[PDB]
């Protein structure tokens, strides 16, 4: 039950990796009702059979250096025809930082939560009868600089695979919607000598107005999550509240307003901390005890 | 077991969300069981490979500047294709205030109605042996406003996005059906040669006629929630009832008639709380001494 | 385990919600395996994909004001259309004065029920032995019209929904089946001009059959919905028997035989614990007790 | 854990609503399989587009009374085109019973038998030590015929359902399976002028060869069900043993050997007892005692 | 937890019942992939909507009179079609009495076993401290002939619905399997006036390859269940030890070895407790001593 | 949570059943997205109704004696047809020893190992002091020879199902591709007689390719489980350790080293227990302190 990751990283995971997701199954698997993704305009002398060969065949021909051209050259019908896959990259390539969080930092955080939430308890609860080992305990664990890399570090992965989905996209967005059309020729092997076959066949790729849309909007909202993203660094503004001075108002308590500037994990901790010790009575107690202060017998009238 | 959320704003999200994912789940998945959204009318020439390609050609036309003619010019066009699109638009965008305030708010909040009710109790069980704690606590929380910020523009928000869903939809509907129908042509690259081929292939959108009646369902139901969200605005008159006033009549508890028409924290505690303590036995012990009243042995004869 | 909501109205909202559903799901989802909901005549000269072309065009022309001829006008063919949405409508409608109840009222009568309960094993268990708070209580919620007024409207917007449906249907079954055949015409834009394609394409909606039927069924369940409903009006006459004179054979109890002719939310009391009272051991010694009698050391021996 | 409903019941219910819901689901949704539930002979000449108007413009026909000819008029087309809606009807009206059952009785009930239980229970711990309440109380849901007359309607309405299937299966297995052949035509409005359409189109009902088999399943078992349903009627020989005789062999217990011949809610609930009382150990014991006896310290020996 | 259905039983019935479920779920649900169940020959002057006709309208001439030729006659035509119902029959017809003893048995048996294993604990008991109730009740349970009926028509229910399988598979698979190709003729009605229409379309029955191949399978596996529900009556031989003299070596039990030669209930209790007793420590510690002494101090060393 | 089946047994069960279940679930399901397993070459001048009525006309043929040419003879187009039912028939010869084992031994072994390790724990209980009875017991368990007779038979079930498919597998793949292609003819009947009817139709059964690739990977995973199979005879030697001496350190337990080289169900329960005995606190205790050892009062210090 305890808030083992926060919100504002939950948040960014949810919105970066639930985006895409969303976009690729929206528009494939409900438009495809609308079909095809390639057609190719055949001479009207060809059978059925015929017309459809040069459609699945031009299909292939898509990435295939001599079958095919535009003024692009090859490169963005690639990217038409691997457009969800790429978007599923970058998808993957988000989730991951949170499943290694979820592996390398949830177990190895999860017990010292636990455990310090009971020395407040302790601190508390001697206070109650009116060593420093939890004091010192995080006194040492400001020297430490280990859990915070892991954490600038998943950040920091975050951040340039976003990054670079906005300039994969602007660009996917820039290119000119007009290279969805492409002259193709199956007039490859044994079909090269075949008089009664065009030297070309104009074909329009379909699904690429979709794309370009939803690129547009992707984009948009990843510009938006860069500075959220940013924000995550500013870890000394992001300790709001010194709430170790709400314990430091009693006397079982110590001057820990431990807001390091330098990359401490202790720090990081007060995040945490700051976080889920919400849930604390005590926390609350001596909240409202110092909230109504702004005489430890007022314990005892709780 | 709390009631964390208003049933004003979950009726509101519920109608809100639910409506839209609705109209698109009808519109859509069902009645494309007549197949095809976009078809034209070839030549009978064309063989049916030819006249395929027209239809999903002309599909992919709609939104680029050349290949149309209408008297709107294309702007329309865009809008019925991408329509369901622009529908899940909204659903998403009213959708993450109350995720927002299920992460932002609930957890923040859970906490103090749990206190509250336990204090409540307390002033309660001291009356039946017949510090302020708790009132120096919600008399400091009236100094404050930051949840109330956060409800405010929650509301805030969801009233802007249901407003300009309103707008379009009103511009979506407004557009004269008949736009519907549109001239293709196909006359591109190499085919812009083929004399073979009709200057223009003439086209209709077939769901158009779904999508204009759906979309005066959705705004009048839009039209009706604003006044409900102004509604919720009116936080001084939604507090109903000074229920502290039952407590107010026990010696244990004091003078907390806090109707702020100020917007303070405490007030939106008194909604929230206004809601939830139903659930107190004291409070119906209360309630019910202070309606038998409309001596304090009383109590002892519960 | 409370039965929270009266077996009436649950079977009243089982009805007419679940029927207009479980219609829709038979005619559409299952017979549209025949696969076409409509079907226009096309000459022999066209192209399979021009008569496809004529079938979907028409489809969208049955709401299109120039487009169309019949002696009923356009407004039938509308109805045949959009007929599983109307049903849908319907089945709405009436889904939520019970989930407007399951929010406005359940939540707000769940403690009443549990207080009076204990209540009257106070009052039973008290006569064991051998202030009147919950007789005083009670005597109070005589004065009050608030709840009831809840389920008064509640009725009544159930009422009202149902009887919009009667109507409607009434009118739908009334429509003269053979207008379900129509003249289409294609003939717009580009085409108005084509000597090839005729003046009219005689057009038949094939699942015009299966609504009329359908309307029918719908129609005379509704009907005799109607006077279940209005004899929920009747609460007064609802209160079958007066229990409170089971436990009023108690010395311990008074004379609540409150059989309220006025609008008194007491009254729907009444109703509610006329339903759960049964549950209670103490009602059932006390009736057995009353249908022996038909002592109170006779109570030692239960 | 009750053993709520007979089992006669629930095995009638269970058979009378799970064979016709089994046989539409065996007959449509696999051997739909086979594609299609009507065709029509075309021309040659006809479009394959054409063709598919035909069949399904006859399939809309068959209900329409002038654009048809059969020796049996048009009735029985009807019924080959609803077949599975009017099975579906009688599941529907088999089902009702049960579950008003569920909750007209139900809940009127389990309070009973578990009031009783626990008498019973008292009868035999007294008899251990070796008011007449329970016997009191029995002997007066003697003079009730409330319950009786749910049931017995409950069960007349399951009869009358059957009853009237068999007579509707009789008629539609007695149809001359030669009638699903019969002849359309097309030749309405417009069409009513054209010479190149044939003044019939011969079509057949293709499923009519299974439905008529599964209505003589379907009658058969019915037809059995009937004397089951008779058999439930003759409630006072259903009464099988008077196990209150086990009891009244105890000084605790009294003569209430009620097999009512008097239609009387108290020989009801004979036969649920007689059901659910298996369940008790002191039935156990006082059969035993009595089997064996076939001297109350015996019971200390137990 | 107890072993309430013999395994024998339900390997039989998993056996009867499984097999022909999954033989049906195989040859159709996947092979049907293939396509189509029946098909003719037509003319090659019939448009593709005629030919269709022509299949799916002798696919119901298969079970009318006139509309065939064969040397079988119609006869084995409507088995071909019918097969898989007629093995879902069979299904039915052995899944019942299982559910029939799942109602009139099951509950009925139950709270014997659990009080007779409580009775042999008394006995194992009070042998620790070194009437014959349990025995007595036993010795009566001699004297009864109800529950045995129920298992010997349940099995011969079983063996009968068996050996009706075994007989028409064999007649089935003896089907000469080129009589699933035959002659049928659509010159009714209209079309038996057309000369453009042969007097014979050939047909072939596709499945019926799979059927008579399924049939050998399912007929040999019946033919193998056929002794082993044959061993099922031989009752007093089933009966294998008479674990009974393992208590009957205690004082505190007595010579029940009373393997019935006779019909008696009492040996199919035998029977079900040789099953279910294998859980009783007692008889686990009773055959570890009668096996070890293969002196009751030694209950004390347990 | 006992280890109540070997997982060697486990293994091979999960193997030999897994694999061709998955083989099937692959070639199948996926791949019969290509469409079609057989396709037979028409004359151009058949109707594509006549085209596919020769593709499922000579489906059937592929078993029927006359129909069909091939150097093989008939016999392996049988195979072709039926090769998923036949690694379906493997599969399921292969489930049954499990699941007979799941219930002709599974519920008649679970009570020993609970009875054995509880005796275990007796012994170590009266060691931590410092009659033979489970000694005598297990002492008694070397004279059977039935349980371990389940587990051979049971074994040699699965290999003899194993082997059987080997040999057949091998057949399936050294039978020459080519053979999937035969000449079928339609000339049956009327069809005998027509002229426009080619003698024969070549044929090709697409999917032979892949079952003769799957049949190599199941021919040589089975030659891998020979062995294995083989190894579980190998019963004296899969004997592992002789736990028992653990035991016998203790003054409170016996010499019982009874690696029995005769089929005594002893070993066989000595197998069981040289699995299950791993969660024993005091085998871990008792192994510990051989361990170490390699005095009594150290029991007292654990």
Known sequence: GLRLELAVDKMVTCIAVGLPLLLISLAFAQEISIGTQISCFSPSSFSWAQAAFVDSYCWAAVQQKSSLQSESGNLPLWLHKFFPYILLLFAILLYLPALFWRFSAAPHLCSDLKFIMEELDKVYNRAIKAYPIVEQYLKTKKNSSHLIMKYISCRLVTFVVILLACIYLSYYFSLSSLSDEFLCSIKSGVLKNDSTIPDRFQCKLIAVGIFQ????????????????????????????????????????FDVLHFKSEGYNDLSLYNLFLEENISELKSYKCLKVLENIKSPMLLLTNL
Chains 1, 2, 3, 4, 5, 6 share one sequence.
């Open 213 to 252: 849309l939803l690129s547009l909007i992707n984009l948009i909202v990843y510009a938006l999550l860069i500075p959220v993203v940013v924000y995550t660094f500013f870890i000394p503004f992001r300790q709001k509240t010194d709430i170790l001075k709400v314990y430091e108002i009693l006397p079982t």
